[PDB]
Symmetry: C2
Subunit: 313 residues, 2 copies
């Protein structure tokens, strides 16, 4: 029996009684609404902030909707800017599903944070999400007047599929720089390497929130090519990776995908903080109300981010 | 050409101008004195601390000499740093790493005990390890002679001392001391056998630690290649303490430390991996003549403070 925290186990037992439908059996609107409901149920409430502002930026296919978060009433001087990419398999999730987590990261970092509402599958398959995430990051990095920030660097961060986007965007910008560098990247339980035949996939593919059926659903909707580094960034370039914090969860079927990325960075001689949260599942960053110990996990990631930013190579 | 910092390159060029014996060609006393002279030349001055005190503790073959460092005049419960010096288990002592020890203690604001473990060839493998283990267990017992109430042990050491760091952590994981190891900091350590590594081929000459020096250490210490006390990559990793692994990019045994960080990830254990770019083995003791290495050390210090303040 894999180690599991008491509060994590109680939450899994509750979710097992719900016995909700598979994502493949829902309409896309129902799946997307169900995900918002799950985070509203399980996560802490959003913090009140002086700056929570909707805006847009030009993208390859039209405007990309963004949301700016800042705990400060004003921030006119040069600053790193956090660029956040939500999870959801590239199919579900939006600015509202991860809203509470965004207010939390912004408040605890005391930094501005921009969340990206990238184009989702299946309506817009791979590579649409990546190209939106890249375009938004390059735009933020240009210090546009409508954001009101003077960016000195970019901090990329994202959970799950958003952790995939984090690494892909970092590789695209390492190859072809934006106006400022990525000064820190934080992929959180990310999909970096293909998970299909991993040991963690065999061990945790049922009963730990993220299921094999869900992974297959996301896989079919997104349609990423297995040999394309923009789909599976373990295949991308690592010897110029930005400073990195890789976060995994010990009970996660795609745990070994994030582990593989940390090892690839080490193989390339690149600094990496590896944090594996013990006894919790995939999605733990959004379970902070009903699994209270996950707030402490998030705060450890925050402290790692502050350490890395204050102590660059 | 591998990336090298300008101040690092200038130091290597100066060392290449020296025309003298290699370590193996000297008497053991001369080799040990030459190592002290190298660190006295290259490193920053030792800091003034109110407590710098020599003492000893019982060990498996007699007394083990120790040195206590504390930036505080008076010290309740506290972590205690236990430091193991480098030198291939052949050279090095309490004086070769004295300046570095005062720096770590001052910057951490913690007490630090350095260990004068038994050295090869007079005492072959595993004598150094067994002395390091005995000293750490004694420190962890909060003995009256030290005057500390230990709440946990922070292990740390460079090169062979980083090997000792990991081995001591494995021996205490298997049979705990009075308090746990709360953090281990192996710095450019030997963890996996380096003999056929790519870094050994790429950096075996021209970068301070040479193939000749590694061969000299190996023929004196004679670690058993099948013994996790010689090569702790072979040991148990799933219960490893919180870890910061530090490597140097121009180091022939760089891949040995990289391998340990990868082993911890494979075991699901938190690990801060820092590879200092453009510097060699021994960079922690080059802070005067290669001034950029002081900033490298301060990054390690900040990593230690982060891990201690934010335990799993």
């Amino acid at each position: 029996t894999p180690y599991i925290r008491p509060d994590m186990k109680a939450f899994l037992e509750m979710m097992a009684q719900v016995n909700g439908p598979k994502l493949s059996e829902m309409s896309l609107d129902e799946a997307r609404a169900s995900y918002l409901a799950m985070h509203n149920l399980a996560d802490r409430p959003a913090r009140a902030l002086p700056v929570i502002r909707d805006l847009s930026c030009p993208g390859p296919k039209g405007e990309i909707a963004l949301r700016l978060y800042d705990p400060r009433e004003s921030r006119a001087g040069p600053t790193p800017v956090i660029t956040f990419f939500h999870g959801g398999g590239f199919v579900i999730g939006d600015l509202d599903t991860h809203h509470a987590l965004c207010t939390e990261i912004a408040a605890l970092m005391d930094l501005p944070l921009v969340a990206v509402h990238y184009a989702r599958a299946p309506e817009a398959p791979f590579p649409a999400a990546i190209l939106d995430c890249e375009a938004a990051t390059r735009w933020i990095a240009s210090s546009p007047a409508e954001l009101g920030l003077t960016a000195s660097g970019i901090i990329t961060i994202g959970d799950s599929a958003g952790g995939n986007a984090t690494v892909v965007v970092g590789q695209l910008l390492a190859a072809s720089p934006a106006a400022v560098p990525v000064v820190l990247q934080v992929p959180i339980f990310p999909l970096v390497a293909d998970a299909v035949s991993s040991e963690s996939m065999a061990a945790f593919s049922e009963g730990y929130l993220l299921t094999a059926e869900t992974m297959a659903f996301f896989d079919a909707a997104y349609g990423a090519d297995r040999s394309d580094p923009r789909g599976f960034p373990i295949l991308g370039r690592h010897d110029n990776a930005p400073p990195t914090i890789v976060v995994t969860a010990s009970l996660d079927p795609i745990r070994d995908s994030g582990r593989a990325y940390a090892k690839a960075l080490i193989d390339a001689g690149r600094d990496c903080v590896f944090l594996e949260m013990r006894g919790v599942t995939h999605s733990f960053t959004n379970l902070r109300q009903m699994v209270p110990s996950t707030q402490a996990d998030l705060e450890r990631v925050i402290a790692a981010m502050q350490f890395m930013l204050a102590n660059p190579a």
